[PDB]
Write a protein that binds this ligand. Sequence first.
Ligand SMILES: NC(=O)c1ccc[n+]([C@@H]2O[C@H](COP(=O)([O-])OP(=O)([O-])OC[C@H]3O[C@@H](n4cnc5c(N)[nH+]cnc54)[C@H](O)[C@@H]3O)[C@@H](O)[C@H]2O)c1
Ligand SMILES: NC(=O)c1ccc[n+]([C@@H]2O[C@H](COP(=O)([O-])OP(=O)([O-])OC[C@H]3O[C@@H](n4cnc5c(N)[nH+]cnc54)[C@H](O)[C@@H]3O)[C@@H](O)[C@H]2O)c1
Ligand SMILES: OCc1c(F)c(F)c(F)c(F)c1F
Ligand SMILES: OCc1c(F)c(F)c(F)c(F)c1F
Ligand SMILES: OCc1c(F)c(F)c(F)c(F)c1F
Ligand SMILES: OCc1c(F)c(F)c(F)c(F)c1F
Ligand SMILES: [Zn+2]
Ligand SMILES: [Zn+2]
Ligand SMILES: [Zn+2]
Ligand SMILES: [Zn+2]
Lengths: 374, 374
Amino acid sequence: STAGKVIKCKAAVLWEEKKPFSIEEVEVAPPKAHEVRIKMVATGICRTDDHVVSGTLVTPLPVIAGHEAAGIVESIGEGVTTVRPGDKVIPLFTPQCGKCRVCKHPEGNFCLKNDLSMPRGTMQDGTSRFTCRGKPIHHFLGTSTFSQYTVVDEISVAKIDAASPLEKVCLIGCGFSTGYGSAVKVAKVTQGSTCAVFGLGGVGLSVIMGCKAAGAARIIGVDINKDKFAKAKEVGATECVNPQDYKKPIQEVLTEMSNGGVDFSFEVIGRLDTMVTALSCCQEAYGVSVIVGVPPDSQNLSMNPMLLLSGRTWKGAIFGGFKSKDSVPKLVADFMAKKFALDPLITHVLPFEKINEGFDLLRSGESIRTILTF
Amino acid sequence: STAGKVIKCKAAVLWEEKKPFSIEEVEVAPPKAHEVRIKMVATGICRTDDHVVSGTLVTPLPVIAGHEAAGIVESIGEGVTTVRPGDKVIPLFTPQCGKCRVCKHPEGNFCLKNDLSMPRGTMQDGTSRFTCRGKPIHHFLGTSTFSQYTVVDEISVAKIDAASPLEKVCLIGCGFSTGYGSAVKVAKVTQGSTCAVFGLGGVGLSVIMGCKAAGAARIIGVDINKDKFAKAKEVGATECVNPQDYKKPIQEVLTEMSNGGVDFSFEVIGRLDTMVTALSCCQEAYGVSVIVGVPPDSQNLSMNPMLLLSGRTWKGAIFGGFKSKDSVPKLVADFMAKKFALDPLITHVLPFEKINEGFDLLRSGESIRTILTF
Ligand SMILES: NC(=O)c1ccc[n+]([C@@H]2O[C@H](COP(=O)([O-])OP(=O)([O-])OC[C@H]3O[C@@H](n4cnc5c(N)[nH+]cnc54)[C@H](O)[C@@H]3O)[C@@H](O)[C@H]2O)c1
Ligand SMILES: NC(=O)c1ccc[n+]([C@@H]2O[C@H](COP(=O)([O-])OP(=O)([O-])OC[C@H]3O[C@@H](n4cnc5c(N)[nH+]cnc54)[C@H](O)[C@@H]3O)[C@@H](O)[C@H]2O)c1
Ligand SMILES: OCc1c(F)c(F)c(F)c(F)c1F
Ligand SMILES: OCc1c(F)c(F)c(F)c(F)c1F
Ligand SMILES: OCc1c(F)c(F)c(F)c(F)c1F
Ligand SMILES: OCc1c(F)c(F)c(F)c(F)c1F
Ligand SMILES: [Zn+2]
Ligand SMILES: [Zn+2]
Ligand SMILES: [Zn+2]
Ligand SMILES: [Zn+2]
């Protein structure tokens, strides 16, 4: 048995920004009290993992990234009550401690134990479970799923259906849930409404899925890469527009197309300019715009607050507004019952060892989600 | 009789920015089709009228300003069905045409016939009813209440209770309804919540009234003028703070006081910096911040969109989100039924002839609302 013992395994270590991941041996300590060690089965490549590489999202290096994943519990530390060895699980990059003021609030999900706002790159106790070449290696969002084995805090893992297909449901750990919840829970898209979705990657496609599920009449996809349009239409876009095709700014185009502004817009890219454009294109008196994309570190946008004074609502969210531990098992159950589809998001599959090729696919524009198998 | 005839009467004409009003004779044309000519009884001095004088708010000059008022219908044009000669009325600076997409929307109030966004300073037909010294004089927001007589479009007037005291209920034309609605309708303040209100003038006091009516447990008033604190407490503030008293930024102070951020914040001043501060002091995952103050013309704010990504909601509104013609008569009826008080807002009552002295009281910090009586 490996329980209580250090595990040597392969992980994808990021030593430096703007460099390939290094697939090499790491030592994974056993779980301490209220920790869970997981044998990973599948992990997706989310653009936020690429943001770590590019320095868009600053987190301490060296690091084991990865946050969209599924696996099987190898062992549990003292006092763990919510999972057992052999359970299928999804790591939760947004924790749910259940005890803080946010966790107790009916509409909050950004648990105060998160490692997103001011990243330390550690476990909850301020230490790391990973060593590589004799050096400590940081965690990422308390999940670090780019490893054959990881250790997470109990508040950062959810037990899921034992019959779940892990190579699909890993997407419920980030991209699907984020986009779908941003539409259905955060924006609260209404039947018959007009939506505009900026960015047609895996998260933006999931936003479209949610807008269609909510009964939107028109769903306008916006992307500078027209190769993204066919899949966007397959999952519910009624029209797609490329800003590069127009002489006028796309907020003006979208306002014209919607006969005075859209009901709901979504920024699903991570650019300051498209955050302001997306706000502007929603109807000035009653429109709602949701920021989903992750902005470049420490940069401020500029905007005219008259856009809000007329009546617009601007908001953002992490993880689609879902309380993570409550929601993830229910989303898996709903997937099992065919309430939504994940296959449209999966364009490529690779072994974990080909992680760098998977990032190349994302960066070239060719993929939506690549799923890596351990 | 005056019906069908030009009326020569007294008005306060603003010939250029940053000068006193000129109190002099104007000619007021009779109402055309779908227009209403009103003998003014009382008008309040709102800070937004001062913004016209100061150039904070750009609108065509020369102008008869004034937008918070009540009077009695003198005559109606062909086709008017909603008011009759002798009726008490409140002019509506935000119209309610009942036909546009905003008027038809359950949550919109910023009717597309408004003259706020891109002010022309005219009647709906693009002409003016006012002349002074042989020159045409612009309207303001389709209201122009700083005159013994005005002409408004039918969509810009509401009939109110014949027994109403016009020297009080004029405040339902702007400041009371704006603040109260910003709390109860736009923010939707909840029972037991903690609110922060930036700016303790007539509008901010009305926000406090609404937060208390909604059952807030804590209402923190924020103003740099500590003379405003006593009245703020009288109408429901539980604490007041002056940013000038602190070594740290007030958003940090308010976050500390509220054990991690407030539920609802309101900017009721009109400064870019306090808009960002007010957003920041609301709880990062579930807080809501409402912009009420009118910012200086054509100036953008700068902010970090991570404030929204964590889960905050940022919105603004005109006139408390109330659909104006539906709401104003009901608010007057509610005042008549003792559901809220207006006297706490009224610090000074002056003849119309003292309009300049009233504006000086506002600018000096001394008054909340001066009511001018014709
Ligand atoms: N809020 C959250 O919880 C959360 C979760 C998951 C992802 N994210 C972020 O969401 C964003 C999208 O992630 P993803 O879907 O994996 O990324 P992605 O697959 O890279 O998709 C982004 C899309 O944006 C398109 N695009 C780039 N620039 C522009 C432009 N100027 N105008 C229009 N389209 C443009 C691009 O072609 C691509 O299809 C990233 O910033 C992620 O970091 C946020
Ligand atoms: N959205 C709307 O429909 C609407 C309606 C009515 C008024 N307004 C605007 O609302 C604002 C308030 O109007 P009002 O109550 O008549 O004005 P007011 O009576 O001048 O009150 C403003 C208050 O802000 C205080 N103040 C000024 N600077 C600061 C500062 N840096 N920090 C903290 N407090 C400060 C000031 O001392 C005063 O008590 C103005 O900008 C109006 O133009 C908007
Ligand atoms: O893709 C999800 C995601 C985010 F939305 C973030 F804001 C963030 F900081 C992060 F690390 C992350 F993984
Ligand atoms: O906070 C403790 C800690 C460190 F000090 C590191 F230098 C490091 F790489 C690490 F992973 C870690 F957890
Ligand atoms: O005080 C109400 C008020 C506003 F909130 C405005 F935004 C505006 F432009 C205006 F002219 C006005 F009178
Ligand atoms: O409304 C028409 C109108 C004008 F066309 C002006 F050029 C002007 F100065 C003015 F005050 C006015 F009211
Ligand atoms: Zn929590
Ligand atoms: Zn992600
Ligand atoms: Zn209208
Ligand atoms: Zn006003």
